[PDB]
Amino acid sequence: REQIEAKIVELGRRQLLDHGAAGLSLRAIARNLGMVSSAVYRYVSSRDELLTLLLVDAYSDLADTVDRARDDTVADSWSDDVIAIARAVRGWAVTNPARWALLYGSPVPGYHAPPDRTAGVATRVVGAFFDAIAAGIATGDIRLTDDVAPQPMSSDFEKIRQEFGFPGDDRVVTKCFLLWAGVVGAISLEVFGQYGADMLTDPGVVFDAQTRLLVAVLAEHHHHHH
Amino acid sequence: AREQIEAKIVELGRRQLLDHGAAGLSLRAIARNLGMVSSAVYRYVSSRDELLTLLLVDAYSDLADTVDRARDDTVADSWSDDVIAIARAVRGWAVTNPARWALLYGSPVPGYHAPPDRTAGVATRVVGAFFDAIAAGIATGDIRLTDDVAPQPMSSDFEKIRQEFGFPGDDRVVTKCFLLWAGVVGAISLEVFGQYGADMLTDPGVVFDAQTRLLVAVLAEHHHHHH
Ligand SMILES: CCCCCCCCCCCC(=O)OC(C)C
Ligand SMILES: [Mg+2]
Ligand SMILES: [Mg+2]
Ligand code: NI
Ligand code: NI
């Protein structure tokens, strides 16, 4: 089976590279497996199910890539950990541009990913960032200021904290959202070609410079609040 | 006479985006839903690529026009309020026009490359507005220029950017301009493309605005240290 479902995922991933989602076809996938259109449907019931399999696969590969890169190390500091994560995410997106598009690019209209399948893997990189930043809180380099956000943002953040076992207060969590948005934004601008013609000679150097600013956001205090 | 037909074609194209994305763009379907014949449509919009190009130009222009309107109702002391107002207007446009945002800043359309002679100008209008708001912060001294040089080749690339946008920054401020654009685009895309998920944030606009205020603090080096 999974030998079969594996091949489906591999095929579908190729159809993604070539035509994007529109061109997903349990029809093509069917021929290749020496199979009748109808035969495939037990393994993968529908175009949607294919899409969710392809999503879980991309998310997992990305997260495994990140996990691997953290196990590689200068354990020196939380900030070096954050940089290593960001660099791994970007490197993965640059090597897998169509799968980056799948994950963080345009939605497939008519498709809604059942969270029960996607939630877990979809938060593993987010989770890595939180884990990395939690180290900087435990060692005092990232100073909690007990600056409470208005509701309902504060209660939103409290759920997020509990989910991830993250000890950052409301300001740290705001800064984490900025970090993630900046990382995903920078990557997508590069990968999707949106800086355009002859603008950046080495987009990676610019990405690294952005990450360093985002680290400095986490490390310094911007309001008179003590 | 063409002009008015082209408009109904483009409006129906905007609808197909909403319903099928760039995939479902079809001049033939359009051609029907206007009680017209397929062969008649190519006379007004000659290909899928031309339809996409019209839809891109339309979207970039509407987005920029929305920014420009929001700035005209920031009547203010403040370069920072301007930056915040631009960012808010971009997000508002994107959430209200999510399929057109996808067309602009989402995944590339396989096989298609926008003609820079139709798209490049309008595509720089909002970036341009941010540089103009930020330049006012530099003029008043809230954003201080240094002689620090960004790591190469950034510094070299940045000189060409400052010239193109008539922006009187230094390297450091330009880096922070790239950060702001990335943060804005990135935050909007995560919300609009449905990564956040339904429940997580009660109003994502509120977190977004907090992020923009942090980006303003980065530009102005508004922080202190306990040394
Ligand atoms: C806060 C602003 C930061 C500025 C950095 C980004 C500038 C991106 C401009 C892209 C224009 C483009 O598409 O032109 C092509 C030739 C086609
Ligand atoms: Mg790929
Ligand atoms: Mg729309
Ligand atoms: Ni302080
Ligand atoms: Ni300082």
Instruction: Show me where the domains of chain A are located.
Output: 1-226
Quick check: B222 contacting A, CB < 8 Å? yes
* Residue B194 three-state SS: coil
Closest residue in A to B22 (Cα) is: A22
Using a CB-CB distance cutoff of 8 angstroms, which residues of chain A are in contact with residue B183?
A: 178, 181-182, 185
A197 lines ligand 1 (CB under 6 A): yes
Give residue A207 CA to ligand 5 midpoint distance, Å.
21
Q: Is residue B141 classed exposed, middle or buried when 0-12, 13-18 and 19+ CB atoms within 10 A define those classes?
A: exposed
Q: How far is CA A85 from the centre of its chain?
A: 11
**Residue indicated by tokens 């791994």:** A88
Query: What resolution in angstrom units was achieved for this structure?
Result: 2.0
Question: What is the rounded distance in angstroms from the CA atom of residue A194 to the CA atom of residue B177?
Answer: 15
Residue of B15, B48, B119, B189 for testing the chain A interface, max A β-carbons within 10 Å: B189
Contacts of A81 (CB under 8 A, 6+ apart): A70, A75, A132, A135
Contacts of A195 (CB under 8 A, 6+ apart): A189, A203
Using a CB-CB distance cutoff of 8 angstroms, which residues of chain B are in contact with residue A90?
A: none
Ion ligand 4 neighbours, Cβ < 5 Å:
A 221
Give residue B222 CA to ligand 5 midpoint distance, Å.
8
CB atoms B175 and A210 under 8 Å: yes
Q: Copy the structure tokens of residue B195.
A: 């990564």
| Most informative mutation of B83, B118, B127, B167 for ligand 1 (most atoms within 8 A of CB) | B127
Q: How far is CA A216 from the centre of its chain?
A: 21
Beta bridge pairs of residue B224: A221
Count of C-beta atoms within a 10 Å radius of residue A39: 12
Whether the bond between B98 and the residue before it is cis, its omega within 30 degrees of 0, is no
Question: What is the rounded distance in angstroms from the CA atom of residue B184 to the CA atom of residue B176?
Answer: 12
Ligand with an atom nearest the CA of residue B86 = 1
Residue of B56, B124, B178 for testing the chain A interface, max A β-carbons within 10 Å: B178
Question: What is the rounded distance in angstroms from the CA atom of residue B108 to the CA atom of residue B101?
Answer: 12
* Residue A221 three-state SS: strand
Give the architecture-level CATH label for domain B1-227: Orthogonal Bundle (1.10)
B127 lines ligand 1 (CB under 6 A): yes
Quickly name the fold that domain A1-226 has.
Answer: Tetracycline Repressor; domain 2 (1.10.357)
